[PDB]
């Protein structure tokens, strides 16, 4: 073989070039930075009314509204301040696995096992929420809808590919391929010109929304990557493995910045989120408890011990005022 | 505290939303959610037709005052089973495997499938209805040769029913724990409503047994 030898030596030497210039670990420098003590957060709100496992949840751009989707077949929009149900939408397929909130607040997108991403319009002149679009063309179950504009949306799937869709036309504007397994989560960058997606192949990658280019690839896990999120400054991203360890990678360094793992944790991370200052990495686990890690020293600075079942989705508001968490008991909890 | 004319109207709307959510959930609990499974080229467009009538394919058929929901899986291609747990609480798993399964080795794939759902923490306490529907080709290919072609476990006489018992006999060995769940195997002639009735009976027997565990008797 010729190309295989070139491919093998390319990666080994490219990694060698990365290793040669690799100076030191994050801890080696940030050791002198004092910890944050104990972040004891109390459950300020308990949003109840879902009658099944809650699979997805997305914060509003104004830091006050929430969307949650259940196996019940319902999509509920809450007022996070007064724990009031602003909207309740019946979804076509009860098998929801992801949801997103339009950054302008006009629309809401949700999808799941039926391979279709349904986009509903909230601000209708007739007062009810209708289905503006049904983005179809994926050949597998859907995940991590992430609106870019009111007329451009990304979607991951179990087809080993992500897709950028022009909602108005309903045609896949771009298709990012290269995965060898179901793609579980994607998270748009702050500037909305990139994104990172992790897949069951135990590898994630940074894709460009404009040119459909596999700009970067990232490895280091030993099992699936069930959750992913972006550092608030759009220069790092943390993935939540089913290996029971979280990993913060830097886009530029081509390497994992650090690992958040503890011996007592034997189960995989279900969702990952960040604090507005990029200090508290919030990891929802299968242990039926979330967990607040100090995102620079890897210490569990507090825990959001709640829910009777595994945590599925986390979210930190835009201003960082709260933390919404969901779990398979059908209760959302807003912690502060 | 006193509330604004609007902030009260917001609270009244939430109650109306809350009422409908609760009311809808009551209707959901009145249905029987049967997860439908099958192996490759086993015959899956013939049992669904017998009922009273892309990814997931959900089917409805109301039979004798029961509203049945049957969720097919022949649309999903990714076999990672990161979506099986979504099918917790199903009242059964209608697993369809026919006798002509060694025409396309079936032993490894078939036994690995059943060992998968009997090992899953989510399904180990749900009954598995086993279907062997037709009787039109189940006899004409048994006489070709003993089952040593792909089933080394048995090297004896191969009749229709006796060998059929062996497949069932080895089957229960797949079930790692028969304390909680129960296989309801079916050997019939796919000529009439036989299939529908058997699931109804296997659905009453699983429901009635579930009540007792709630009463603490069974």
């Amino acid at each position, epitope marked *: 073989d010729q190309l295989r030898q070139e491919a093998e030596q390319l990666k080994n030497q490219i990694r060698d070039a990365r290793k040669a210039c690799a100076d030191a670990t994050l801890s080696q420098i940030t050791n002198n930075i004092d910890p944050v003590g104990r972040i004891q957060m109390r459950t300020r709100r308990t949003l109840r009314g879902h009658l099944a496992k809650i699979y997805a949840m997305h914060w509003g751009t104004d830091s006050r509204l929430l969307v949650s989707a259940s196996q019940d077949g319902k999509l509920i929009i809450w007022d996070s301040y007064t724990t*009031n149900k*602003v909207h309740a939408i019946p979804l076509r397929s009860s098998w929801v696995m992801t949801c997103a909130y339009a950054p302008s607040g006009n629309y809401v997108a949700c999808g799941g096992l039926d391979n279709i991403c349904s986009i509903y319009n909230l601000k209708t*002149r007739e007062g*009810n929420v209708r289905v503006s679009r049904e983005l179809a063309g994926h050949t597998g179950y859907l995940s991590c809808c992430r609106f870019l504009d009111d007329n451009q949306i990304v979607t991951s799937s179990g087809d080993t590919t992500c897709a950028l869709w022009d909602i108005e036309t309903g045609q896949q504007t771009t298709t990012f391929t290269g995965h060898t397994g179901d793609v579980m989560s994607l998270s748009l960058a702050p500037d909305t010109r990139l994104f990172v997606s992790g897949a069951c192949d135990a590898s994630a990658k940074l894709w460009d929304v404009r040119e459909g280019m596999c700009r970067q690839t990232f490895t280091g896990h030993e099992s699936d990557i069930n959750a992913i999120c972006f550092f608030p400054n759009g220069n790092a991203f943390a993935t939540g493995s089913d290996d029971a360890t979280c990993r913060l990678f830097d886009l530029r360094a081509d390497q994992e910045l650090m690992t958040y793992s503890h011996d007592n944790i034997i189960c995989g991370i279900t969702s990952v989120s960040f604090s507005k200052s990029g200090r508290l990495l919030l990891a929802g686990y299968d242990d039926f408890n979330c967990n607040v890690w100090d995102a620079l020293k890897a210490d569990r600075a507090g825990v959001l011990a709640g829910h009777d079942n595994r945590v599925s989705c986390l979210g930190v508001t835009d201003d960082g005022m709260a933390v919404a968490t969901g779990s398979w008991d059908s209760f959302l909890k807003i912690w502060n | 505290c006193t509330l*604004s*004319a*609007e*902030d009260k109207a*917001a609270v009244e*709307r939430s109650k109306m939303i809350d009422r409908n959510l609760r009311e809808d959930g009551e209707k959901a609990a009145r249905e029987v959610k049967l997860l439908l499974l099958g192996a490759g080229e086993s015959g899956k467009s013939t049992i669904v037709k017998q009922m009273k009538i892309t990814g997931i394919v959900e089917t409805h058929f109301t039979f004798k005052d029961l509203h049945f929901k049957m969720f097919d899986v022949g649309g999903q291609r990714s076999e990672r089973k990161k979506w099986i747990h979504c099918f917790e609480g199903v009242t059964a798993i209608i697993f369809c495997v026919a006798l002509s399964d060694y025409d396309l080795n079936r032993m490894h794939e078939s036994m690995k499938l059943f060992d998968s759902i009997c090992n899953n923490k989510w399904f180990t306490d749900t009954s598995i209805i086993l279907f062997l529907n037709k009787k039109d080709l189940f006899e004409e290919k048994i006489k070709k040769s003993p089952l040593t072609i792909c089933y080394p476990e048995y090297a004896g006489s191969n009749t229709y029913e006796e060998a059929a018992a062996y497949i069932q006999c080895q089957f229960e060995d797949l079930n790692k724990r028969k304390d909680t769940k129960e296989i309801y195997t079916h050997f019939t002639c796919a000529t009439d409503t036989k299939n529908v009735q058997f699931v109804f009976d296997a659905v009453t027997d699983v429901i009635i047994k579930n009540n007792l565990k709630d009463c603490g008797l069974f």
Partner: single-chain antibody
Amino acid sequence: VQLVESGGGLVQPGGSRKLSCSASGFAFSSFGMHWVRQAPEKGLEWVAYISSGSGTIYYADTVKGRFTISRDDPKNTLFLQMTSLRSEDTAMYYCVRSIYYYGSSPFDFWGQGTTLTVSSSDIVMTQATSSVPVTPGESVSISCRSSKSLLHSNGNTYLYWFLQRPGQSPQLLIYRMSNLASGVPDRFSGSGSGTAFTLTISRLEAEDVGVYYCMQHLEYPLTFGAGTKLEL
């Protein structure tokens, strides 16, 4: 959306009539309804309210217990049955919808109104004047005063601005003193704090003439301003 009311006409005192508001084009059951009225060339005046689900009902203190409001949601037909009408109940009765949740414009659409004629504590909202001549291209500022401070602890200043062009029905412009309504040009802008409030119209157009109105929704009963008329 199209709300059309029927039931207007001339009725002698002491009788009883019924006004229907046959809705078409929206989710009737999700909208609370009002029956704002207007006496001839005097000003607007609220009449009744009926929330979604027919749970809440409020009446104006002038006719409380004399009018009754009923909503027929499966049919999309709202009623207001007036029992005893005096010589003061003559007015143009409008049928207004209102949807209350976090971020709604709860006075967005106003029906076409119906003419009803009869033969012969509360917050007070005051408008400074009754006529203001102006020419196109000149920015204008209208202001009305309130008795209490509308700024609720929430922060919402429940002040509503309407515009009744000659021969038409009102049309919301500012639903909470700073938020533009739907479908109105973005030149309108509202401000003001405490009791005082002002509406500023930059780059006034020819069709912006009409009797403006300011209404409060901090607490029932709903009260309307006297009415400022822009003249050209």
